[PDB]
Amino acid sequence: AALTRDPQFQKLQQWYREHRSELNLRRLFDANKDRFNHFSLTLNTNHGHILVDYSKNLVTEDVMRMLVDLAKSRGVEAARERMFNGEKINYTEGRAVLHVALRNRSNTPILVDGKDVMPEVNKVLDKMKSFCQRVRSGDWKGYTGKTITDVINIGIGGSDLGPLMVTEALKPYSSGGPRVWYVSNIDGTHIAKTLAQLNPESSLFIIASKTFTTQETITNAETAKEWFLQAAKDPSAVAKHFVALSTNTTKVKEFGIDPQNMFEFWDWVGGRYSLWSAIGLSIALHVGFDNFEQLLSGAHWMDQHFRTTPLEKNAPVLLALLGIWYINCFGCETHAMLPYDQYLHRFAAYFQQGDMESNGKYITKSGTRVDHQTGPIVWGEPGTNGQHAFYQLIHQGTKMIPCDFLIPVQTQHPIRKGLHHKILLANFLAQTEALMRGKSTEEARKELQAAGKSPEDLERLLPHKVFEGNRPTNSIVFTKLTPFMLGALVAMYEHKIFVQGIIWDINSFDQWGVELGKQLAKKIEPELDGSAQVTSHDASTNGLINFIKQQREAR
Amino acid sequence: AALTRDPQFQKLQQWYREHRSELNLRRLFDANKDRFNHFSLTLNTNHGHILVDYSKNLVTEDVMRMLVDLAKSRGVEAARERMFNGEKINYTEGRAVLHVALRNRSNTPILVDGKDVMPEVNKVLDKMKSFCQRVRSGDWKGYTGKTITDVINIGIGGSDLGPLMVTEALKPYSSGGPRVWYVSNIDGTHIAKTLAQLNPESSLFIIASKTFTTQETITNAETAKEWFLQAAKDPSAVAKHFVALSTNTTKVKEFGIDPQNMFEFWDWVGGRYSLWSAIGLSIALHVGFDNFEQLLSGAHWMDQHFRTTPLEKNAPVLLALLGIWYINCFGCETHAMLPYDQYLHRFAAYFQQGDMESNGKYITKSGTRVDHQTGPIVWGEPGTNGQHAFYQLIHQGTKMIPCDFLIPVQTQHPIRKGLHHKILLANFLAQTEALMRGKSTEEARKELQAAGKSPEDLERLLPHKVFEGNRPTNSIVFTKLTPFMLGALVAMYEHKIFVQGIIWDINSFDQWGVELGKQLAKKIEPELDGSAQVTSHDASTNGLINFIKQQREARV
């Protein structure tokens, strides 16, 4: 595979083999009072600052130089320029990759097949702006003349997670917007418990699907339409309550949707990179189009940082390189994302798709199987909740787990004269400090002596109180979680994922790994009907089906 | 460490090194038509069946025999008896471990320090039952005479995740109950956005904390009380709107809650095993005490299954042992929990605490450091949501990831004549089938040719379309997700976690690993006040603090 043959990767591996044991964070900070200055970035966006503090990582200046040289050798800059120039870097599908065009606020031309995409991007943005104004102002009325109070996004995967994450994160910016709901699961619970809380006269459904043929989304859409028509009766009323994020005019019109309420996007918009497109309509309806434009502007700011900053000071690049170090040298399977912000409670889940569906790959550009690890398992929960759930294992288990800790300096809810946010910040800071410093046997012994423990009780408890430390983290601190700053943060991680994929020589922008499950599910569906025993699969699948059929009519 | 020195563990390791390359699931199923019958367990709880199908695991009869021999050699059954008998198996804290007493519907005595705990367990349950009836019927009035419409649980960790997971999972059973809200984060967003939606006249706050000193919970509770008194003014109205769940009668009274409003629990109830106790009050208020009693009864059934079933047929033991195989022989860091049930959307998050805080440990009972892996990282989202987020990596990444797939046969919402649930079931079945079978080069090439790909295009795309398969799963299928069945399933995983901890020789029931972060936060808190530079820590902590102080003033 390309990475394993790269001379700069081999140099990194040799250094790791020879020097792993000198990487102790306590000793590194004790020997370099300037370590924070050397291993951190501060970004002024003009709409808030971002501090990316990567100094609590198991790195030295030589490691960082070797990592930057790996990015150079692996062609990160040339690949970045191909993306931004509209070249077909999604090579298995033969497609451009242009989520950066969706937020290209400068309107500099970006050509695909010799034709600028920016007029089409802006035409859809203009359509979104108009529609948002009409819905939010009460100009758009339902079939009985009432204004829209609830917007229901129906979609799966990329059509769901991004809009949900963003409307959750930007909830304070939604005064004057309708409530938003997200239905994604095919499990009938999801639509059924949603519809039970809604009034058909005042509900607007957004059906998010390029093809308008996606099974789960279209089944949910058909269930919603049947519920709506049970109240409204008139098929012509559907066009007041259903819009589409799609390009299938024929199917959208067949569904009962006015084709002037189809909001288009393009094949170079990957679903897991799509919240910046028409797929973000529910964001713009909830927080307003002006705030949606701020979100796009933040992403655009970070796109420029990624383009113009030397690799050695380029935030997405450094985040990516640190991840390569832990994955391909230390062997860490996972990466935890730990935002100390309840509004960001769905941020880790969003990057589960963005990161894992992008880089959970094993075939390289040349068709050759990787002989190294690729993308990690991403997971996490907001702090301080996660601190009371699973940090026991991060501190005192047997796993090395790189963690990104994120927090805004300024809270959206400065209640109690700032007391809650003060405590939140103190925990944010203390947890990374604790992971780095640990607590030695001698330190824990002193504490036990002071508590008045007998010699026997002390020796018995002492090892359990030791924290080995040396557990690395990134801390990402930003002035305030505004629409613009959220866009910059999401884009930062998008480009991190991109850089990692280039280094691994995989395609971050396809997803062939989803096909086999879809094919097998289509074969099983018809076999579940009827009482006949199924014998057409392996013995486990058959046994499971036959148990399902037996238990179907158990009271 | 004990596990590493165990001869049965060594035999398991030796077999793995010699035979690992022969474990291919296609070939195993092709060679043994009875594989599903030999590698599955059916339980009839009398309140639904549970099929634990472990046949899509990289195991043979000999592996399972060696694993059961390991459980015997590590003393699993004797340790189980110590737990059920009230012995102080939480040995670093000198405590009994008796969540099984909280749901002991049989009322057989369980002694701690020579006294049966069941009378006090049942006294608190009776108090819960009477309180729930009064609140739900409207007999309990707020300070202006109105009935309670909203119950707000304030707690974090073990005082939050269980009650939240269960009330989410049992939402169909909450007709006639008040709305429930969970406030847990110290982040002021959490309480602020909740209080903005509530009327003080009709809201009941439940302050849940084992010691009643958790900083987050008491701060949130004080903020709620301040908001409530801004409307009510009169301090005696607090007794109509605030109750406590705790072990610390003194700290609850110091907070100013009426002693008759305290629902007690005990030191031998771990927080992450506490939903079965007074901590479950918000469950009982939302779905009714009768449904809470069914939840307890389900757990009690599974406790008895775990206690009375020979190891080779014992569901939590087998799940535990399959996990040991993947963790200590294959080296898998993680365990994915994938319920195909939207109501179970917080089940994996609950077992992040239950599993990782229990078994994320590194010191053994003798004080020796482990020289082997312990607890895995648990993660997951419900199907089919997770399927469209991260299954790409499970199918075609570079990681081996044991997955538990769970589903009820019968849906709570059989809409469209069962169409949605038919599709959900088909995906549940197809995903584990796909993970097992994969798709070979030869098979993928045939598909590309039939689709009419040119030779150039076929050869370019072909490797990307291959699925290596051999990815193991458990499938756990149960009749319906009722209160009883949820109780049984949660207890099953509690006992899995217990068995693994005994095998690893660690204490599943302490949590000394949370102390250092708490101590360091208490030191940083006063340093954040005022404008002075901080220089007292390592350079990173100092630099982060100083950036916070700089940007605290910034006008965006």
Curated annotation (Swiss-Prot), chain A:
One of its GO terms (biological process) is canonical glycolysis. Changing R74G: In CNSHA4; GPI Elyria. The modification Phosphothreonine is found at T108, T249. D-glucose 6-phosphate binds at G158, S159, S209, K210, T211, F212, T213, T214, Q353, E357, H388, K518. Pathway: Carbohydrate degradation; glycolysis; D-glyceraldehyde 3-phosphate and glycerone phosphate from D-glucose: step 2/4. One of its GO terms (molecular function) is monosaccharide binding. Changing R346C: In CNSHA4; GPI Mount Scopus. Gene3D superfamilies: 1.10.1390.10, Glucose-6-phosphate isomerase like protein, domain 1. The modification N6-succinyllysine is found at K453. Strongly inhibited by erythrose 4-phosphate. The active site is at E357, H388, K518. Changing T4I: In CNSHA4; GPI Matsumoto. PROSITE patterns: P_GLUCOSE_ISOMERASE_1, P_GLUCOSE_ISOMERASE_2, P_GLUCOSE_ISOMERASE_3. The modification Phosphoserine is found at S106, S184, S454. It is found in: Cytoplasm; Secreted. It comes from the Eukaryota. Its EC number is 5.3.1.9. SUPFAM superfamilies: SIS domain (SSF53697). InterPro entries: G6P_Isomerase, G6P_Isomerase_C, Phosphoglucose_isomerase_CS, SIS_dom_sf, SIS_PGI_1, SIS_PGI_2. Its main location: cytoplasm. Changing T223M: In CNSHA4; GPI Iwate. Homodimer; in the catalytically active form. Monomer in the secreted form. In the cytoplasm, catalyzes the conversion of glucose-6-phosphate to fructose-6-phosphate, the second step in glycolysis, and the reverse reaction during gluconeogenesis. Besides it's role as a glycolytic enzyme, also acts as a secreted cytokine: acts as an angiogenic factor (AMF) that stimulates endothelial cell motility. Acts as a neurotrophic factor, neuroleukin, for spinal and sensory neurons. It is secreted by lectin-stimulated T-cells and induces immunoglobulin secretion. It is linked to Anemia, congenital, non-spherocytic hemolytic, 4: An autosomal recessive form of anemia in which there is no abnormal hemoglobin or spherocytosis. It is caused by glucose phosphate isomerase deficiency. This is Glucose-6-phosphate isomerase. It comes from Homo sapiens (Human). The gene is GPI.
From Swiss-Prot, chain B:
Changing S184A: Retained full enzymatic activity. InterPro entries: G6P_Isomerase, G6P_Isomerase_C, Phosphoglucose_isomerase_CS, SIS_dom_sf, SIS_PGI_1, SIS_PGI_2. It catalyses: alpha-D-glucose 6-phosphate = beta-D-fructose 6-phosphate. The modification N6-(2-hydroxyisobutyryl)lysine is found at K33. Pathway: Carbohydrate degradation; glycolysis; D-glyceraldehyde 3-phosphate and glycerone phosphate from D-glucose: step 2/4. One of its GO terms (molecular function) is glucose-6-phosphate isomerase activity. The modification N6-malonyllysine is found at K453. In the cytoplasm, catalyzes the conversion of glucose-6-phosphate to fructose-6-phosphate, the second step in glycolysis, and the reverse reaction during gluconeogenesis. Besides it's role as a glycolytic enzyme, also acts as a secreted cytokine: acts as an angiogenic factor (AMF) that stimulates endothelial cell motility. Acts as a neurotrophic factor, neuroleukin, for spinal and sensory neurons. It is secreted by lectin-stimulated T-cells and induces immunoglobulin secretion. This is Glucose-6-phosphate isomerase. It comes from Homo sapiens (Human).
